[PDB]
Amino acid sequence: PRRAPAFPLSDIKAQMLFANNIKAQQASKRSFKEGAIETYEGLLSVDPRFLSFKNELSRYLTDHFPANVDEYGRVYGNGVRTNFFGMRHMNGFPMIPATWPLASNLKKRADADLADGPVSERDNLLFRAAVRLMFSDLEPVPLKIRKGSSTCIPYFSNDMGTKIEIAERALEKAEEAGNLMLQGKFDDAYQLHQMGGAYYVVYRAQSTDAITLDPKTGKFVSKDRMVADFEYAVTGGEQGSLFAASKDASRLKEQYGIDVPDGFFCERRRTAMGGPFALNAPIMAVAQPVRNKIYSKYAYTFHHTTRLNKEEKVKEWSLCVATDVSDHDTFWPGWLRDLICDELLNMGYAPWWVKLFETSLKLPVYVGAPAPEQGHTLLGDPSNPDLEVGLSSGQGATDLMGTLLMSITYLVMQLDHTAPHLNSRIKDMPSACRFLDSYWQGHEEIRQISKSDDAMLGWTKGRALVGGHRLFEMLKEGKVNPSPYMKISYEHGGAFLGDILLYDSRREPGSAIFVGNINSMLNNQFSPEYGVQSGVRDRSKRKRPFPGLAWASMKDTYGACPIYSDVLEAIERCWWNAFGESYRAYREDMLKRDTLELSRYVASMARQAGLAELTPIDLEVLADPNKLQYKWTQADVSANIHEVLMHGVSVEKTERFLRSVMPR
């Protein structure tokens, strides 16, 4: 059922993806690379004292604080959902091999018994109503670009000046490029305007993953992560194999002379993709105004900040169901891309812009190095983009694509299983829009708070409440999938956007509280995804600009966890045993140094200003800007702090671009 074409790096089709510069050529050729991360300045992830510390601490905390999760996946008591063995990885050393990305997810969806389009007219109206509500009365804003981010295919530039030029040029030439694509002239659009080509596959670490201790043997077991070989990826699973990647770290002693303590493993590696910047810039110019609309008008469902902000909504509910979606990005349906595009055309959006948007979600993928002696292959033909990868992580609107799919998927689940009396309110497009507008503002007896694949579904008192309880029971039983669209289950230890919903003896939302996840504190402090990048002079360009700052926001973020104090004492005791030093003093010194360094980057901050004007969100984001890509948004961060991490193209250039895209 159609194997995707594949081209080696030597092929002209792959060569055309990399510009005639050292950075682009190095990216094309880069072989498999691995190494210990510099966890903190002058400390490697594989340091014997650090691994001794991790062994003692993970064992102690699991022993003294076993998980408190009930039969319905509700967290209670200590606020712990699993063991603390997730920290036991040799950070910087990945599992081998990483997966080859699936060129087509059509068979994957069909075999999982998931729909190839909207099941009913009601569902079709709801998905289309979501497009009309999300993309309608948008306001232009400056196009913000992350400092130090790559432009990927074809230039691979990390320079802000070059990035601004590329983005401004892209906004000027998007119409001409989109019109060429409408004529089927993809090669011309790419050659002239660098809009097309492929996504560049980057493999990212998921630093902590499940590890269990087998009581029978006293030996640790890592969670098996299934990977697809090249044959499986190109055939969409028709041929080739899906097998467990090797997390065995024994190899590090032989290859690198690194001592590997018992029960320490190689890290899980996830595919991530970087988009061709010239294609992403015109998409981002529309995506940011869309986020501003949904986070303002539909703030109830979509805008999530603090644990108390979430708590105020959830406390009003009679029932709260914390859902889980299996492999969201790979299962994301191409028919939704086509439905979105069709509806934007119906609204009066520029056909050339819709074509660029459509193309961004069908683009080929360049596979770098999943393992030693593997990769350097382009999947799909850039002359006619036709891939069905699901949702590409580096696309300019991925968060919105996951949010649109999932928000409607959950609403449909609530309609099907709990509220058939509301079906009469969804008769046509105007009534579908009126109903969805009301639902998204939290005005109906069925409610939700969501972001992509993370959500909490609510029921107030009323006719739907009884159905709500049956749906929860169906999820607990786990025999029937409640959705025709995605694989839905209940979360084992309900949480929403990093905050655990802590229930009491009553097991009711009214008396439940949102608390920080203590395991996330440990993940962030002892298993960061990236090293400190001490060689990158401009700190704002680093993946972890100011790691020391997270100590100042720790109490605000995690202080509400029942075992907060216990964990900090256990850390201090174990760090003393391992290093013969105070961890608290070590972090206080790092906090002082990073606070001083920060003033160099903030115009409003004098030579030794201090953190007085900064919020806990500001501090968490300066230590980890990745939180700005999955947890928070621009409006949640102080203006002077957002400027440290991002730079923009003028609103004058974006305003003119947006006028040409949008309906009359």
Residue number with CB closer to Mg ion (388 or 454) = 454
Supply the minimum distance, in Å, between the C-beta of residue 83 and Mg ion: 18
CA distance 74 to 563: 17
Residue number with CB closer to Mg ion (298 or 331) = 331
CA 493 to each of CA 82, 434, 490, 527, 554: distance values in angstroms, whole numbers, following the listed order: 9, 35, 9, 21, 22
Binding residue for Mg ion (CB under 5 A) from 241, 296, 326, 346?
326
453 is in an annotated binding site: yes
- Contacts of residue 228, Cβ cutoff 8 Å, sequence gap at least 6: 99, 100, 101, 102, 237, 240, 241, 242
Q: Which range touches Mg ion (CB under 5 A), out of 121-129, 132-140, 196-204, 326-334? A: 326-334
The residue to which tokens 């660029």 are assigned: 356
Sketch the per residue contact string, 544 through 583, with Mg ion: x for CB under 5 A, - otherwise.
----------------------------------------
Supply the minimum distance, in Å, between the C-beta of residue 491 and Mg ion: 5
Binding residue for Mg ion (CB under 5 A) from 209, 454, 499, 594?
454
Residue number with CB closer to Mg ion (190 or 410) = 410
Q: By CB under 5 A, is residue 223 in contact with Mg ion?
A: no
Supply the minimum distance, in Å, between the C-beta of residue 312 and Mg ion: 18
Supply the minimum distance, in Å, between the C-beta of residue 324 and Mg ion: 5
Sketch the per residue contact string, 282 through 321, with Mg ion: x for CB under 5 A, - otherwise.
----------------------------------------
Supply the minimum distance, in Å, between the C-beta of residue 204 and Mg ion: 18
**Site size for Mg ion (CB under 5 A):** 5
Q: Which range touches Mg ion (CB under 5 A), out of 27-35, 392-400, 454-462, 582-590? A: 454-462
**Residues 480-539 close enough to bind Mg ion by CB under 5 A:** 491
Q: And the tokens for 452?
A: 């992509």
The residue to which tokens 């790092």 are assigned: 590
* Helix, strand counts (H, E) of the chain: 25, 21
Binding residue for Mg ion (CB under 5 A) from 322, 433, 436, 521?
322
CA 375 to each of CA 101, 205, 239: distance values in angstroms, whole numbers, following the listed order: 11, 18, 18
Compute the radius of gyration of the chain from its Cα atoms: 25
Sketch the per residue contact string, 412 through 451, with Mg ion: x for CB under 5 A, - otherwise.
----------------------------------------
Residue number with CB closer to Mg ion (172 or 324) = 324
Q: Which of 170, 121, 127 is nearest to 284 (CA)?
A: 170
User: 202 forms bridges with which residues in the sheet?
Assistant: 272
CA distance 622 to 539: 10
- Contacts of residue 348, Cβ cutoff 8 Å, sequence gap at least 6: 662, 663, 664
CB atoms within 10 A of CB 538: 12
Residue number with CB closer to Mg ion (326 or 660) = 326
Supply the minimum distance, in Å, between the C-beta of residue 595 and Mg ion: 34
CA distance 336 to 123: 12
With beta carbons less than 8 A apart as the criterion, state whether 399 and 60 touch.
no
Give contact residues for Mg ion (rule: CB under 5 A).
322, 324, 326, 454, 491
Please state the residue numbers annotated as binding site for Mg(2+): 453, 490, 494
